[PDB]
Amino acid sequence: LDGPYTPDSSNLPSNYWYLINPLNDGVVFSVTNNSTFWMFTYLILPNTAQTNVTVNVMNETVNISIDNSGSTYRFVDYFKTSSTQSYRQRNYLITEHRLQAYRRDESGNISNYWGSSTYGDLRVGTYFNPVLNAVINLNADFYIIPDSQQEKCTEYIKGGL
Numbered sequence: 001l002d003g004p005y006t007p008d009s010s011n012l013p014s015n016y017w018y019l020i021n022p023l024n025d026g027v028v029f030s031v032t033n034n035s036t037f038w039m040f041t042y043l044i045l046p047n048t049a050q051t052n053v054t055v056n057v058m059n060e061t062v063n064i065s066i067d068n069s070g071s072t073y074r075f076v077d078y079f080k081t082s083s084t085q086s087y088r089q090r091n092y093l094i095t096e097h098r099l100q101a102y103r104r105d106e107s108g109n110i111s112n113y114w115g116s117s118t119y120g121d122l123r124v125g126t127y128f129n130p131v132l133n134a135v136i137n138l139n140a141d142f143y144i145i146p147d148s149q150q151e152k153c154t155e156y157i158k159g160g161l
Contacts, residue, residue, distance in 0.1 A: 001152065003143035012104060012136045015147040019101040019156060022140035028075070029102060030137040031110065032058050036081055037129040039110060041100060042066065044074040058137070062087055072118060075100040079127065091125055094118060097160040101145070101153050108132025113157050122158055124150070 004021065012018065022028040022043055030040035040057045048068035055062050064087065068074050075093040080086060093100055094116035103111045108130030115121040145153045 020140040
């Protein structure tokens with residue numbers, strides 16, 4: 001819709017969907033308030049055997065295991081809620097397209113798509129962990145779709161550009 005825009009980090013406005021279309025796998029999204037929420041999304045390519053990988057995200061070194069082995073992409077969310085904690089895997093998106101999208105509401109809650117494009121179980125999920133006014137890192141090219149057109153965003157997630 002509006003875009004494409006190059007990767008960027010900033011205090012993104014609320015009530016917009018940022019539809020990311022990543023050139024690269026790995027970390028494509030991240031945000032933290034450095035207090036009670038750290039979140040990133042890792043893009044796993046198709047046919048990825050089980051691998052332990054080390055990434056640098058928001059000034060921390062992180063070790064995670066990734067597995068796909070499917071024909072489809074997997075966008076996997078990770079989060080932790082205290083500094084000394086390790087990140088744990090949470091929800092994920094299985095999809096034949098290089099698309100995931102993020103929205104922050106007026107309370108600071110991050111939403112993104114969970115489930116799949118393939119299986120008929122696509123959901124708008126929310127992590128009820130406010131990070132209002134935190135910088136959001138979009139490590140991907142992206143489009144911007146207003147909340148009023150949320151239905152259109154879902155169509156791209158499910159169907160591709």
